[PDB]
C-alpha cells in the first residue's frame, strides 16, 4: 500500500525534523567537550 502524496510529505518532513534534532544533539555534545 503506497502512501498517498500527503502522507509521503508528512514522512519526508519527519525525516528532516529528526535530522535537525540530530544536529542539535551534536552541537550540545561538542559544547560539553569544549568545557573539559
Amino acid at each position: 500500500v503506497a502512501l498517498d502524496p500527503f502522507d509521503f510529505s508528512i514522512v519526508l518532513n519527519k525525516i528532516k525534523s529528526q535530522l535537525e534534532e540530530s544536529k542539535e544533539w551534536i552541537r550540545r555534545s561538542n559544547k560539553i567537550l569544549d568545557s573539559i
Binding site: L3, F8, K14, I15, W25, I32
Partner: protein, 50 residues
C-alpha cells in the same frame, strides 16, 4: 577528575541521542523508499506490461 569524567559521560549521552535521531530518520527513509517501491510494483510495472 570526577568533573571531567562526568562531562565526557554527558557528551557521549548527547552523541548517543544524535545517533538515535539519525536512526529515526533512517526508519522513515525506509518507509519512504518502500512507498516508491510499492507504487512502482503496483501501478507502473503492470501499466508497462499492458
Amino acid at each position: 577528575a570526577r568533573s571531567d569524567i562526568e562531562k565526557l559521560k554527558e557528551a557521549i549521552r548527547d552523541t548517543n541521542k544524535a545517533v538515535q535521531s539519525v536512526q529515526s530518520s533512517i526508519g522513515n527513509l525506509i518507509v519512504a523508499i518502500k512507498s516508491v517501491q510499492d507504487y512502482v510494483n503496483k501501478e507502473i510495472v503492470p501499466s508497462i506490461a499492458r
